[PDB]
């Protein structure tokens, strides 16, 4: 670290009116009470009303940025229809250097912390000046908060129980 901090790239309020945002899950819990990762958001349709999205951001802060999102893999289809109302998956997270799309399906898996479902997590740096775009037909984890930063040098990592 030379600088590292957390800010609110897209506030939960007012970034996503047209998708219901307040879904969480129960393995992700707090003192035996359900929850979800602070930095991030679910999105689903407004009472089964999924519109599809295109959003973006580019740096104004002039510091480097770190960004995170997710790609939804249900364990069953009735979720996929009920939330997002498309068997089609197509997402496009785009930048200048990096860009990638995602078109997954339902892939059943075994219980792991009582979860067959999966969301594969995906991430990138973003420098000053460069833009990110999201586009999607759903199946997403969206950034609420993102990590502003500078680089660092030479510091590192330990595993230790001392």
């Amino acid at each position, epitope marked *: 670290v030379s600088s590292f901090e957390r800010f609110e790239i897209f506030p939960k309020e007012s970034s996503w009116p047209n998708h*219901t945002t*307040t*879904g*969480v*899950s*129960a*393995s992700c*819990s707090h003192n*035996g*009470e*359900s*929850s*979800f990762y602070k930095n991030l958001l*679910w999105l*689903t349709g*407004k*009472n*089964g*009303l999924y519109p599809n999205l295109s959003k973006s951001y580019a740096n104004n802060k002039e510091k480097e940025v770190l960004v995170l999102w997710g790609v939804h893999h249900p*364990p*069953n289809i*009735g*979720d996929q229809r*009920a939330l997002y109302h498309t068997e089609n998956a197509y997402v496009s997270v785009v930048s200048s250097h990096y860009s990638r799309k995602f078109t997954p399906e339902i892939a059943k898996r075994p*219980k792991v912390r*009582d*979860r*067959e*479902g999966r969301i594969n997590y995906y991430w990138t740096l973003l420098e000053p000046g460069d833009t990110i775009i999201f586009e999607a037909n759903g199946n997403l984890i969206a950034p609420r908060y993102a990590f502003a930063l500078s680089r660092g040098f030479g510091s590192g990592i330990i595993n230790s129980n001392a």
Partner: single-chain antibody
Amino acid sequence: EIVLTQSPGTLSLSPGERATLSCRASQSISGYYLTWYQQKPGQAPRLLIYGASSRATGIPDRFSGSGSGTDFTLTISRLEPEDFAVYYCQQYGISPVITFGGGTNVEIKGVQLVESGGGLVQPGGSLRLSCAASGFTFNIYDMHWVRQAPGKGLEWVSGLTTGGDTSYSGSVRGRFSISRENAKNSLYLQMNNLRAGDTAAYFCVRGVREVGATGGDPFYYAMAVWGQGTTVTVSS
């Protein structure tokens, strides 16, 4: 959340007849937003229809609806004397506040929850209820406590998401207080400052799958399942 208007709150019709019922609100309200119930007096509610079209489990094919925006509608293809019942109109606010139509009597002319503590207290008094769970994961679902005066329109006393965002009505709030326990698989409702408006039968209600979990469990934005309820009364 918005005031509703059922149409009609009672009707009297013969066998071998349809029955058109229109529950409409102030504003236009998005369509997979309502769910439709029945109840026999003496029985708990039962689930029928959701989102103005689609149909629940363990069913004939006769109760079928339509409508969108401001005006939602459940129609009925055939009437029968086994249907002698009050039907209800229960909608999930975007303000997460369930709102209720006031029951619609059809007159025909010629796994589980368990509640705990219902009974009497004195007015202005203090008492608690509990519920307890059986054979599921009380972790997941968004829970609701509900009330019903006898042969009356319901009122939604309270609900809470498992993330902890409460929702009450502005009159009821403060005088009631909830608390949830998942490792214990049980629910609690301590209650104080109690008047004759609480003279009614209450229900513990298991609602909506939050986002994510293993199962062969779909969700709707309707209820999941009811409880058998219990009476509560103030008197002297």
